[PDB]
Design a protein around this nucleic acid. Sequence first.
DNA 1: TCTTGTTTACATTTTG
DNA 2: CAAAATGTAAACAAGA
Length: 85
Amino acid sequence: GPHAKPPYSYISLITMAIQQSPNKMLTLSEIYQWIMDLFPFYRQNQQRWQNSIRHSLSFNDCFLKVPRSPDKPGKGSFWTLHPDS
DNA sequence: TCTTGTTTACATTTTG
DNA sequence: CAAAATGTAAACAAGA
C-alpha cells in the first residue's frame, strides 16, 4: 500500500478517539470510522485490524464498556476509559 | 445473519 | 538478547 502504518499502537488509536469524543465514549463502529477517516492505511485489511481492535478492547482493562441504553438504544455498547489513566 | 464481545493460543515488536 | 507489550488468528457467544 501507498501509505505507511501510523506510528500509533491500537491502544493509542482507541485512546485518542475516545478522549477527543464529546461524550468521552464511543461505539465500536465509531472507533472503526475514526481510525479510517484519519488514516487511509486502515482502509484496507479491515478484517484483520478491526479484529485486533475488538481484541484490544476486551483484553485491556483500561477499556470499559458502558451500557447504552434503556432510553436511546441501541447498537453495541459505548466504550470509554477507566479513570485510571 | 451479521456485528459485537470474549477468550485462547501464538506470533511479533518494543524496550530495559 | 529476554521480558513485556502489542498484534494476529480463530472459535464461540451474545444480541439487536
